[PDB]
Amino acid sequence: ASPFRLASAGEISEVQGILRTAGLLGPEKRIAYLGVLDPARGAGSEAEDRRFRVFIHDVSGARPQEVTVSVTNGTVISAVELDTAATGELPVLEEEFEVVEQLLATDERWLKALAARNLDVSKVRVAPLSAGVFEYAEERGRRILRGLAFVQDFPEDSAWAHPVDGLVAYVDVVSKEVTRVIDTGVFPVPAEHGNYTDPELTGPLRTTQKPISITQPEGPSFTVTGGNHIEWEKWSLDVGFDVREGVVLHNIAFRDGDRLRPIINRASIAEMVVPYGDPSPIRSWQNYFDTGEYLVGQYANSLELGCDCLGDITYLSPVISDAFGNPREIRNGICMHEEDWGILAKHSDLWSGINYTRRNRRMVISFFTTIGNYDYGFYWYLYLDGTIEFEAKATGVVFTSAFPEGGSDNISQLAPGLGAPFHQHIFSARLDMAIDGFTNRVEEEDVVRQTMGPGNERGNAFSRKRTVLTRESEAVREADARTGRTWIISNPESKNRLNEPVGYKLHAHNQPTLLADPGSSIARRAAFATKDLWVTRYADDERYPTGDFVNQHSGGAGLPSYIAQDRDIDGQDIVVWHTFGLTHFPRVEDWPIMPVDTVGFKLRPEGFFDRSPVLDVPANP
Amino acid sequence: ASPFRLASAGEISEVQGILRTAGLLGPEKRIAYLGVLDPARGAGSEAEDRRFRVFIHDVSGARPQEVTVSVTNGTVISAVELDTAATGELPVLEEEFEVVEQLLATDERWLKALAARNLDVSKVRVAPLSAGVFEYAEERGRRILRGLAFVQDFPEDSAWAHPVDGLVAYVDVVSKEVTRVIDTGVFPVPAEHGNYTDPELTGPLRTTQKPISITQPEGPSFTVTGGNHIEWEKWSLDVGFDVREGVVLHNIAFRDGDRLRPIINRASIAEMVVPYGDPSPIRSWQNYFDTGEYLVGQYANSLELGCDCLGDITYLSPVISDAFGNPREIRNGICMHEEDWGILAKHSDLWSGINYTRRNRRMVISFFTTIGNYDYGFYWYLYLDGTIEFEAKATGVVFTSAFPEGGSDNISQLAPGLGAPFHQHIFSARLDMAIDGFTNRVEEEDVVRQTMGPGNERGNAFSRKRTVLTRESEAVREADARTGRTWIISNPESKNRLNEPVGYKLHAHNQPTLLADPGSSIARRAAFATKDLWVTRYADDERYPTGDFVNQHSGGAGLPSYIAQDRDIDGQDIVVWHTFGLTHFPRVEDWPIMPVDTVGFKLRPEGFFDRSPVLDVPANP
Ligand SMILES: [Cu+2]
Ligand SMILES: [Cu+2]
Ligand code: NA
Ligand code: NA
């Protein structure tokens, strides 16, 4: 059995039992995170060893714990009481969905604010919004959530159409106290509904769309073995799933001839954060770490055939733990399929008389998640020619506010009275590299302009330069689109037939990075997001660019602490962390539900192969 | 009948006759360019008036002519003798394909160079390479081609595998003289073949690709009327085709309710150039204006069903003129089809209980062309949500050279002895804008970072700024990826329901622009390529960013001369010219035939609509 197989229900049940048999999963405990650990380096000689890591919350007020269990052996490997003021609070619990609303609904300050605005408390929705760290000393070491009000006129109404601006509240979840209620003044609650299934708003539905049918009469070209091992068009990999990160790809490798050549050891989106750029005190604290605070895998959607994934789809249904250690399946949570991708290569040659055309295809591994108002699709693609790409598709309903009557430098107008504060959605892809094995290095490659003169008399020459990043202190890099900057991951000990080191080149989109002031709380807690590329030396405990416990953690955790080790990354086992995001000034067209927008990156082989790896693709039938 | 219909064979035949009946199409003339003119502004009240513009070469040595004919009336509208030293030489003629090779094959200098290298002249291929303008005074006012040698070992061999470096020749086409033969010394001719259909190089073909079948059982959702008018999912447009530009889109408009709203009056790729960055004198002159010198429409491929365009495809077969004024059809030269495009919009709402997913689709209008070694696919896409995108797909065989034995700062290695000089492929999209009509303006929009302090105490705020480009002298703009720079085209006299001007935002890829030294010949002749965005006031004679006659034209023509008029572009009939390109350092994986790489741009509505324009899309069946 593969040590990279997906967690089974049985494994989750055994963890529950171990935590029970060991006395750590009392009646008052809540599992905030549970996931299988990857195998340790080299340990994979040939021997079963499945360990799970668990974060356990306590609703009675006692200290939470981080616990690692071996399900193979039925033993607790380590169990540590956490001091949350020091190392952070645990991820937001699904059970806290309704708690902020419920606590506020009996608070006299909250009720006074709603009553001033003539709002029926039974119609006021409030989400568990993450708190971050600001000026409130009472919050240090307490599990805090904040709450903003949205009115639902009726149970199926879109509450996002009706934000209640000028009002915010904070809650101590464990003590069940409302610590603060802030009311900066009355803003009109936007009146129009945003019900995108109401015929009065949609108009008559189009009758003009004729079907598009995608079928595979002989079935798909990939195989799935051991539950999650994929083999497709020379690619080999394992599809993992973690409640925090979502779909993770392991052991990405390409069969070049009769050699299985590793490329990427693990690829994941290790963090994703949505910082808001509205300086109103009602929202200026808001930065939603969808991955690190909320856990994007936990909220993976069940994907409907013909609707979310079209064509011949093979599904995985990953198993996660609920708060009590009971396994539950996310039915049809991962889609896997191959797609036609246009022309692969084409040439019509006058001299030889040969006309040649080949088609491309990609293998797609995807999931969709929902975090509050946002819905995101995470797509990994593998192409015939060796290209690897990630794409995020951002949709959902935009987070709303009032639109101030004098306009705004930080909020856009969507409908009368209705605003959308500016924000970014910033991802971190953690790519544990293994180009032809683990001995890798990273070079930054810039185009080089040349001056007209001796050696270049016609002033046409241009060139390239590559700079090796040798130590972590040197490996925090920024984009330079104007100079075509890319980063090449190579194996200095593996050469192609031309005696050049094999490599892959990362092509970024060069979108803006984190816009916040560098002195801000968010710049400190999401320091990864301030730079496009970081390279670290692999360590098994360096998993997330924001650290292990993101919720209410002080600034400084994660990448900026890791790289202080200033380790050798020149021909070593290294990890690339690429920051990329969308900067969103919402448009009227984003309302009442937003069309998908995209951001991502790709890696293309760069002298990895000895010639095109797709000369054996046959002409299409 | 629509004045924007494609030229018919009959129209071409009538032009031939007029040029004949009028005495301008003697036996010794060669048509180098022929195309229908667009209708003049406002002239389209309701009245037939089809005019054709023709460039006529003379092989006897007399002066060439530019001629405009009315086929509606059977009259010559204007006919002007050209002084080519002043206004440029005429586009390269298809009949010159073999002339450089033929002239060189009897030249004693050329033969001496081949004999030194033991090359059989009958196996040496030479292309009509464009000359540009350099230090050779004898070339001013003469029609010159240059020639580089490639060996074909047998008639179906790929000559690109066997470049003969150290050797170049220039030819006066009309006088049939070889003006110069330059031999800088012997480089080994690369030995390996690049025959990507030879089983010894491809290996056994893959048997693993299972079919992907895309069908439309009720046919396509678009209609085609009047030969080239498309109606699809609220979009309305006319598909044109010109021998220089290729596919051109006219009258792009969107039916919002019961109003047909114009968006773009004409969209085309008005120039595309491939400058080379190798300072060797064997190649340092080479810059191929695939559009302006060679005419990309002329070489549009006939596209094979199931191979080049997959699914339910409607073809156009555009008619062009041969050198003698005879019409000829490019059978199946344009593909039109709709494609599924993933998720359009999706949200799962906990409060309302509503789960909503919709799928996107795009209308595709495409052609593929071949210019020597290059093959490019030009794709225009229209999406349901109002997005317009262009994508170029670059493939073919890379232009080769020797690989110098000491390595190179300007050439990459592909195979033993075989190099590929560095180059760029740079496009200019000419977008004659008509956002809600012709009264338009352009703003440059940058993200605005804000300092932590009063009004922004938590240091989270960020904003945007828009700067109106008011006159042409101000409208030559560069990218700023780091600040998320985009350009918005709006109609200041047309407001959406929120009282904001309707607009579309151009999102560029922010790839490097022209790398050559600013003092270079190519920087002067392709000045457009040195900046990402230009805005001009519409003029019917301002068609190409490089001017009308690109071949051997001195520096200075086109956009930099046009914008010297410093015209008002603030709420006027304007044209956006966007430069975008690929910078290519060829990889081993590009050899012996290159996988497709892409570049392009898109425009998305920005307060053009009063809310999402896709709320009436129904759930998929
Ligand atoms: Cu957003
Ligand atoms: Cu190229
Ligand atoms: Na590694
Ligand atoms: Na215009």
Q: Do B595 and A344 touch (CB under 8 A)?
A: yes
Query: Omega before B279 cis (within 30°)?
Result: no
Domain extents in chain A: 1-87, 94-195, 196-619
Sign of the Cα torsion A240, A245, A247, A249 reads negative
CA dist A608 and A605 (Å) reads 5
Beta-bridged to residue A396, according to DSSP, are A374, A594
Q: Which of A202, A275, A484 sits opposite B511 (nearest CB)?
A: A484
Tell which A residues from 567 to 606 touch B, by Cβ distance under 8 Å.
Answer: 583, 585, 587-596, 604-606
Beta-bridged to residue A269, according to DSSP, are A429
CB-based contacts of B456, cutoff 8 Å, min separation 6? A279, A517, B450
Phi, psi at B202, each rounded to 5°: -80, -30
CA of A590 to the centre of ligand 1 (A): 9
Residue A130 corresponds to which tokens in the numbers above?
Answer: 């993450």
Cα B547 to the center of its chain, rounded Å: 15
Q: Which of A308, A360, A608 sits opposite B596 (nearest CB)?
A: A360
* Strand bridging mode B129-130 / B75-81: unpaired
Phi, psi at A593, each rounded to 5°: -140, 140
Q: Give CA separation, A225 vs A5, A222, A238, in Å.
A: 10, 10, 9
CA of A443 to the centre of ligand 3 (A): 15
- The H or E element containing residue A507 is strand A501-508
Q: Which of B456, B589, B595 sits opposite A279 (nearest CB)?
A: B456
What region does A459 belong to: left with phi over 0, alpha with psi -120 to 50, or beta? left
- Cβ atoms of residues A247 and A333 within 8 Å: no
Q: How was this structure determined?
A: X-ray
Chain A residue closest to B517 (CA)? Answer: A459
Other beta carbons within 10 Å of A455 = 10
CA of A383 to the centre of ligand 3 (A): 22
CA dist B55 and B90 (Å) reads 7
Phi, psi at A351, each rounded to 5°: -75, -45
CB-based contacts of B406, cutoff 8 Å, min separation 6? none
B294 annotated among ligand-binding-site residues: yes
Active-site residue, from A33, A170, A276, A374: A374
Beta-bridged to residue A495, according to DSSP, are A501
- Taking the CA atoms of residue A584, residue A588, residue A592 and residue A596 in that order, the dihedral angle to the nearest 10 degrees is -50
Q: Tokens 């001839």 label which residue?
A: A257
Tell which A residues from 328 to 357 touch B, by Cβ distance under 8 Å.
Answer: 338-340, 342-354, 356-357
- Cβ atoms of residues A82 and A549 within 8 Å: yes
Q: Tokens 């619990």 label which residue?
A: A93
CATH number of B94-195: 3.10.450.40
Q: Which amino acid would we find at residue A170?
A: Y
Say whether A139 sits in a helix, a strand or coil: helix
Tell which B residues from 1 to 60 touch A, by Cβ distance under 8 Å.
Answer: none
B293 annotated among ligand-binding-site residues: yes
CA dist A536 and B23 (Å) reads 76
Chain B residue closest to A408 (CA)? Answer: B463
Compute chain A's Rg from CA coordinates: 26
- Cβ atoms of residues B344 and A598 within 8 Å: no
CA dist B527 and B132 (Å) reads 14
The burial of B208, by beta-carbon neighbours within 10 Å (0-12 exposed, 13-18 middle, 19 or more buried), is given as middle
CA dist A212 and B360 (Å) reads 11
Q: How many helices (H) and strands (E) does chain A have?
A: 7, 36
Q: Give CA separation, A206 vs B60, B78, B223, B472, B484, in Å.
A: 62, 50, 15, 43, 35
CA dist B524 and B522 (Å) reads 5
CA dist A494 and A496 (Å) reads 7
Sign of the Cα torsion B396, B400, B403, B407 reads negative
CA dist B285 and B121 (Å) reads 24
**In angstroms, what separates the C-alpha of B319 from chain A's closest C-alpha?**
20
CA-based angle A552:A553:A555, to the nearest 5?
125
Sign of the Cα torsion B367, B371, B373, B378 reads negative
CB-based contacts of B259, cutoff 8 Å, min separation 6? none
What region does B321 belong to: left with phi over 0, alpha with psi -120 to 50, or beta? beta
Resolution in A: 1.5
Say whether B257 sits in a helix, a strand or coil: coil
- B1-87 fold: Nuclear Transport Factor 2; Chain: A, (3.10.450)
Q: Do A206 and B97 touch (CB under 8 A)?
A: no
Tell me if chain B has a CB within 8 Å of the CB of A259: no
CATH number of B196-619: 2.70.98.20
Q: Do A210 and B197 touch (CB under 8 A)?
A: no
Active-site residue, from A38, A157, A238, A290: A290
CA dist A123 and A204 (Å) reads 29
CA dist B584 and B178 (Å) reads 32
- DSSP string for B347-394: EE-TTT--EEEEEEEEEEEEEEEEETTEEEEEEEEEETTS-EEEEEEE
CA dist A142 and A174 (Å) reads 8
Tell me if chain A has a CB within 8 Å of the CB of B510: yes
Domains B1-87 and B94-195 share a fold: yes
Chain B residue closest to A403 (CA)? Answer: B498
- Work out how many CB contacts closer than 8 A connect A with B: 455
Q: Which of B150, B210, B447 sits opposite A218 (nearest CB)?
A: B210
- Cβ atoms of residues B150 and B122 within 8 Å: no
Beta-bridged to residue B394, according to DSSP, are B376, B597
CA dist B488 and A411 (Å) reads 18
Q: Tokens 């021998």 label which residue?
A: B243
Residues of A in contact with B607 (CB under 8 A): 587-589
CA dist B438 and B417 (Å) reads 56
The burial of A597, by beta-carbon neighbours within 10 Å (0-12 exposed, 13-18 middle, 19 or more buried), is given as middle
CA of B618 to the centre of ligand 1 (A): 24
Compute chain B's Rg from CA coordinates: 26
Residues of A in contact with B352 (CB under 8 A): 152, 155-159
